[PDB]
Ligand binder design. Structure first.
Ligand SMILES: [Zn+2]
Lengths: 217, 101
RNA sequence: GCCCGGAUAGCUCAGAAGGUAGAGCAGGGGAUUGAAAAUCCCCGUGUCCUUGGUUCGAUUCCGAGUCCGGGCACCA
RNA sequence: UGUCAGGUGGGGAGUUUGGCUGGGGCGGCACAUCUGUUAAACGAUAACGCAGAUGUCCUAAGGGGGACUCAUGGAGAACAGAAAUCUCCAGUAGAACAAAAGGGUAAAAGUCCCCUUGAUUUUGAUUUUCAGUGUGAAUACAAACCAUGAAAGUGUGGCC
RNA sequence: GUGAAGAGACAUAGAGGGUGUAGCAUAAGUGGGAGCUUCGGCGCCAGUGAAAUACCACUACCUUUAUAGUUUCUUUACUU
């Protein structure tokens, strides 16, 4: 009630994030995610659609970024926190299978310039695949300092071969009433794919890294 | 017969109202719905004692059936219908070509 | 038009869930016997109906499309 | 026992069980169409007359532009032979053009190479069978919107 | 009309149930994920692969049952 339990939506957050015993407390910035249970859970014959819809309030489990920019973007990247890379450097990474797995699992975010979106998904593709961390659309005239927010804001919506999604919804840094709000947006994009959402005001928990048995609906 | 899949053609549109790209899918007939005026007139009549108060066709000579193409626009996604001459086989897309062996 | 079942070596018939490609019919040689049969041994034979697909891999599984053989429906 | 629904039910009830046709029936299609001829040098024209075809196949075998000549024969080139590929000379079509047959076509309507969707939209006028009714096909424009070519042009499906 | 006792669940339940191969080792999956913990230990780290593990949770796939809820019911008794 009150637009998906607005009374105990922020008190849920207030009791988790600022706690060492209940929420363990890691050194990196603790990110929050959701879970919801619809009656629409069918494996399907057609197979699942998967449409990566954006959100204006930023999702963003961004630890490291490994770019592929050249000429303009190498100058812009080195000034910022990220680190640049060359075209011939990609051939050295692919030459052994181990260093591809380091780029796959940890380095989640990506930035690739307009000229370097014509050589990328061949070598990584088969080895990567299940993670699905491919580059973002970027041109040479971008700012890079601002472009970190665009990758951070966007998130995957792939649903195949399992009856669950887990879309992130802010973190420790973001405001209290945003997270949730985001809750209205996050569920709405599930309603875009499915027919019957079950049923506007459904189920939630708050799982911020060490989200304990606080268990929601 | 084979057809290209997508093709350029005129659409009425009203925006628009010129040549543009299209998708191509095959037209299938809808289910009879059970609440049309003729079905209600038929079921009211056919109830009592008498048995089949109308004609039942079973002198079907010819073999095939005309193929129809449901064209769907790209921009405003309005739809049209373009018929085709009678043929037994029909692959909507798209085993080209070949020539020049 | 509906919802089901089956396809495998030249022939015929298994296969069976997770990782193979097989008994037989024959067909070819050995072993055995004074020989002629019956029996132990060692071979050659595959688009696993057809396509993209599905898959770490699959004839299977998984979902499409066409070819063979059997059922309950019928107002131009 | 009563009402409604599913099977069974010639035990009984009602009704139909083509036409042309050297009598009918058995065959056949001459019963919707197309080519040549019968058909008597405008058109029209019969028989279960004669020789034969159709219920399809094609995103190219449709549309535009540019290259180039085919049947067959002769003279020469290792394996190569009557027949493989290569080169020259003669070559009015004696080839080819999705199928029946007739017509048509040679810097092409044939063969090869480049780009595409005029097999598109809105409606009427007009030839053929003809009651100058319909059905089918075909021809010539108007207003649009496109393709192709340096252009003139050509194209509202298949050379007729 | 009136009484007795055997079966399919839907709530709602976590104990587990998972052993091809390479991987300390019996990996059903999906996310967050660099420390929880006094120390202990196990992870990040490193490494084997198609897939990474702790620490937290959600979803399946199979067994279990002890809930007085649905009825496919199935078994007998009582006279008006
Ligand atoms: Zn339009």
């Amino acid at each position: 009630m009150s637009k998906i339990t607005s009374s105990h939506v922020r008190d849920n957050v207030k009791e988790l994030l600022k706690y060492s015993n209940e929420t363990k407390k890691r050194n990196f910035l603790e990110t929050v995610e959701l879970q919801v249970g619809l009656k629409n859970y069918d494996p399907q014959r057609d197979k699942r659609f998967s449409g990566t819809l954006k959100l204006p309030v930023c999702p963003r489990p961004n630890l490291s970024i490994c770019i592929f920019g050249d000429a303009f973007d190498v100058d812009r990247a080195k000034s910022c926190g990220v680190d640049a890379m060359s075209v011939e450097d990609l051939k050295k990474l692919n030459k052994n299978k181990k260093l591809i797995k380091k780029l796959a699992k940890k380095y989640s975010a990506f930035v690739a310039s307009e000229v370097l979106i014509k050589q990328v998904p061949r070598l990584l593709g088969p080895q990567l695949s299940k993670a699905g961390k491919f580059p973002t659309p970027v041109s040479h005239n971008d700012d890079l300092y601002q472009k970190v927010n665009d990758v951070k804001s966007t998130i995957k919506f792939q649903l195949k071969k399992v009856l669950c999604l887990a879309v992130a919804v802010g973190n420790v840094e973001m405001d209290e009433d945003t997270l949730v709000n985001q809750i209205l947006m996050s569920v709405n994009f599930l309603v875009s794919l499915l027919k019957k959402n079950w049923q506007n005001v459904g189920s939630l928990v708050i799982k911020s890294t060490m989200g304990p048995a606080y268990r929601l609906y | 017969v084979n057809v290209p899949k997508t093709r350029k053609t005129y659409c009425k549109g009203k925006e628009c109202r010129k040549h543009a790209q299209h998708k191509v899918t095959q037209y299938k007939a809808g289910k009879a719905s059970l609440y049309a005026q003729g079905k209600r007139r038929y079921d009211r009549k056919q109830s009592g004692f008498g048995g089949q108060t109308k004609q039942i066709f079973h002198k079907k000579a010819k073999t095939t059936k005309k193929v129809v193409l449901r064209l769907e626009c790209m921009s405003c996604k309005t739809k049209t219908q373009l018929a085709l001459k009678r043929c037994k086989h029909f692959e909507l897309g798209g085993e080209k070509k070949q020539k020049g062996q």
